[PDB]
Design a protein around this motif. Structure first.
Motif, PDB file in Angstrom:
ATOM      1  N   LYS A   3       0.758  -1.240   0.000  1.00 32.39           N
ATOM      2  CA  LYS A   3       0.000   0.000   0.000  1.00 32.39           C
ATOM      3  C   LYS A   3       0.795   1.302   0.000  1.00 32.39           C
ATOM      4  O   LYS A   3       1.859   1.403   0.613  1.00 32.39           O
ATOM      5  N   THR A   4       0.255   2.293  -0.707  1.00 35.30           N
ATOM      6  CA  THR A   4       0.844   3.628  -0.782  1.00 35.30           C
ATOM      7  C   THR A   4      -0.103   4.554  -0.015  1.00 35.30           C
ATOM      8  O   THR A   4      -1.258   4.197   0.244  1.00 35.30           O
ATOM      9  N   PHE A   5       0.369   5.738   0.349  1.00 37.22           N
ATOM     10  CA  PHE A   5      -0.479   6.674   1.070  1.00 37.22           C
ATOM     11  C   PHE A   5      -1.665   7.058   0.172  1.00 37.22           C
ATOM     12  O   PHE A   5      -2.816   7.062   0.611  1.00 37.22           O
ATOM     13  N   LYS A   6      -1.370   7.360  -1.087  1.00 35.96           N
ATOM     14  CA  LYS A   6      -2.395   7.753  -2.043  1.00 35.96           C
ATOM     15  C   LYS A   6      -3.563   6.766  -2.074  1.00 35.96           C
ATOM     16  O   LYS A   6      -4.723   7.161  -1.967  1.00 35.96           O
ATOM     17  N   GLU A   7      -3.246   5.483  -2.211  1.00 39.11           N
ATOM     18  CA  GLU A   7      -4.261   4.436  -2.269  1.00 39.11           C
ATOM     19  C   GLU A   7      -5.117   4.408  -1.003  1.00 39.11           C
ATOM     20  O   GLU A   7      -6.346   4.406  -1.068  1.00 39.11           O
ATOM     21  N   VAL A   8      -4.451   4.391   0.144  1.00 37.60           N
ATOM     22  CA  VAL A   8      -5.116   4.367   1.435  1.00 37.60           C
ATOM     23  C   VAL A   8      -5.912   5.640   1.729  1.00 37.60           C
ATOM     24  O   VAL A   8      -7.016   5.582   2.272  1.00 37.60           O
ATOM     25  N   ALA A   9      -5.351   6.791   1.375  1.00 38.35           N
ATOM     26  CA  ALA A   9      -6.028   8.060   1.611  1.00 38.35           C
ATOM     27  C   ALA A   9      -7.301   8.133   0.773  1.00 38.35           C
ATOM     28  O   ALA A   9      -8.339   8.590   1.242  1.00 38.35           O
ATOM     29  N   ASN A  10      -7.213   7.691  -0.474  1.00 39.44           N
ATOM     30  CA  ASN A  10      -8.382   7.705  -1.340  1.00 39.44           C
ATOM     31  C   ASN A  10      -9.439   6.727  -0.830  1.00 39.44           C
ATOM     32  O   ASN A  10     -10.637   6.975  -0.969  1.00 39.44           O
ATOM     33  N   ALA A  11      -8.998   5.620  -0.241  1.00 44.58           N
ATOM     34  CA  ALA A  11      -9.949   4.650   0.296  1.00 44.58           C
ATOM     35  C   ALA A  11     -10.755   5.362   1.378  1.00 44.58           C
ATOM     36  O   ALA A  11     -11.971   5.192   1.478  1.00 44.58           O
ATOM     37  N   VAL A  12     -10.071   6.172   2.182  1.00 42.12           N
ATOM     38  CA  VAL A  12     -10.735   6.910   3.250  1.00 42.12           C
ATOM     39  C   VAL A  12     -11.616   8.018   2.683  1.00 42.12           C
ATOM     40  O   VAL A  12     -12.680   8.314   3.231  1.00 42.12           O
ATOM     41  N   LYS A  13     -11.164   8.630   1.592  1.00 42.27           N
ATOM     42  CA  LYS A  13     -11.924   9.696   0.940  1.00 42.27           C
ATOM     43  C   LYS A  13     -13.228   9.084   0.443  1.00 42.27           C
ATOM     44  O   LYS A  13     -14.303   9.659   0.600  1.00 42.27           O
TER      45      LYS A  13
ATOM     46  N   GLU B 125       6.020   9.715   1.227  1.00 39.59           N
ATOM     47  CA  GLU B 125       5.467   9.782  -0.121  1.00 39.59           C
ATOM     48  C   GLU B 125       4.700  11.078  -0.376  1.00 39.59           C
ATOM     49  O   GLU B 125       4.605  11.537  -1.515  1.00 39.59           O
ATOM     50  N   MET B 143      -3.662  14.161  -3.250  1.00 38.01           N
ATOM     51  CA  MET B 143      -5.008  13.779  -3.662  1.00 38.01           C
ATOM     52  C   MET B 143      -5.485  14.380  -4.978  1.00 38.01           C
ATOM     53  O   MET B 143      -6.542  13.996  -5.484  1.00 38.01           O
TER      54      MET B 143
END
Ligand code: CA
Ligand code: CA
Ligand code: CA
Ligand code: CA
Lengths: 19, 145
Positions: A3-13, B125, B143
């Motif tokens: 996992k990357t931050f982007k992937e996880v952050a978007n999951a939360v979004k 990142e 984002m």
């Protein structure tokens, strides 16, 4: 794969849109 | 016509609700996540949410039903507002900086257990000013890029 931050952050979004 | 990154993100979102990895989202799991996001839905509302997309009428939400639900529930709210909400979810103490510990505690709470090494890497990142933390501006940059 790992996992990357982007992937996880978007999951939360996505998940937070239910509010 | 979806990119594997998007699919991955939706799968990740699905797994956050599906905490027992049993393949479906129950009113219980739907409620757990929503509560973890500062919401407080009633059982009746949770039931309504599932029934609105429970095409196979089995009382739960599977992946294709989840995406159906998300496709319509995020069309009554734009991006910037959602991105801002996610930030608030990560920045627990609301000091304007997502710390490594906050990122770790948050994801664990949502069901994604990550190591200190992994979280430190995630922060890196998105970190732009190299202070080992993610502020709103940096978060928005990640984002929207
Ligand atoms: Ca489940
Ligand atoms: Ca179903
Ligand atoms: Ca903070
Ligand atoms: Ca920073």
């Amino acid at each position: 794969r790992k996992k990357t931050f982007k992937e996880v952050a978007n999951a939360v979004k996505i998940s937070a849109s239910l509010m | 016509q979806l990119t594997e990154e998007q699919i991955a993100e939706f799968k990740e979102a699905f797994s956050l609700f599906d905490k027992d990895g049993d393949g479906t989202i129950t009113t219980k799991e739907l409620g757990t996540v929503m509560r973890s996001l500062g919401q407080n839905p009633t059982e009746a509302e949770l039931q309504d949410m599932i029934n609105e997309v429970d095409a196979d009428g089995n009382g739960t939400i599977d992946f294709p039903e989840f995406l159906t639900m998300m496709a319509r529930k995020m069309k009554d709210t734009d991006s910037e507002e959602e991105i801002r909400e996610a930030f608030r979810v990560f920045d627990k103490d609301g000091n304007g900086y997502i710390s490594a510990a906050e990122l770790r505690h948050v994801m664990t709470n949502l069901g994604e257990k990550l190591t200190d090494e992994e979280v430190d890497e995630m922060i890196r990142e998105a970190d732009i000013d190299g202070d080992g933390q993610v502020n709103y501006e940096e978060f928005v940059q990640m984002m929207t890029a």
